[PDB]
Amino acid sequence: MPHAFKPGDLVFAKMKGYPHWPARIDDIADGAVKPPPNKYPIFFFGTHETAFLGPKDLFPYDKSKDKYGKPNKRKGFNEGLWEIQNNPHASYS
Ligand SMILES: CCS(=O)(=O)N1CCC(C(=O)O)CC1
Numbered sequence: 001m002p003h004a005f006k007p008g009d010l011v012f013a014k015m016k017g018y019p020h021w022p023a024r025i026d027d028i029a030d031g032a033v034k035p036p037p038n039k040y041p042i043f044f045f046g047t048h049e050t051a052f053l054g055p056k057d058l059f060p061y062d063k064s065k066d067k068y069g070k071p072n073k074r075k076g077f078n079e080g081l082w083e084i085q086n087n088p089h090a091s092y093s
Contacts, residue, residue: 002060005025005040005055005058006025007025007026007027008024008025008027008089009024009025009060009061010022010023010024010060010061010062010084010088011023011024011025011042011058011059011060011061011064012059012061012064012065012068012069013042013044013051013053013057013058013059014057014058014059015051015053015057018074019068019072019074019077020059020064020067020068021044021045021046021047021077021080022044022045022046022061022068022069022077022080022081022083022084023042023043023044023045023080023084024042024043024045024084024088024089025040025041025042025043025058026040026041026042026043026050027041028041035052036052038054039052039053039054040052040053040054040055040058042058043092044076044080045076045079045080045081045082045083045084045088045092046075046076046077046078046079046080046081046083047075047076047080048076048092061084069081069084069085
């Protein structure tokens with residue numbers, strides 16, 4: 001049975017006007033800006049951008065990859081696919 005999301009979990013993350021995007025739940029570093037309540041810091045692979053999202057927009061990677069894990073034309077998407085599959089826990093700073 002599922003637990004709540006935790007730092008290191010891999011997902012496709014959905015934001016308005018974008019295809020479901022490979023991403024991970026990030027840690028918050030000491031001294032770093034915390035997300036609003038009920039929100040998680042989401043690091044998007046490929047673009048290397050962060051946004052704050054709630055669970056409604058977070059699709060666990062293993063379950064969803066056969067649907068969402070396909071090449072897309074959008075900038076940084078295919079880079080993103082490589083990273084989630086090949087080094088999802090690396091530093092991309
Ligand atoms: C979600 C795909 S993305 O990595 O291109 N990026 C789009 C702009 C987003 C924002 O509006 O905050 C951050 C995420």
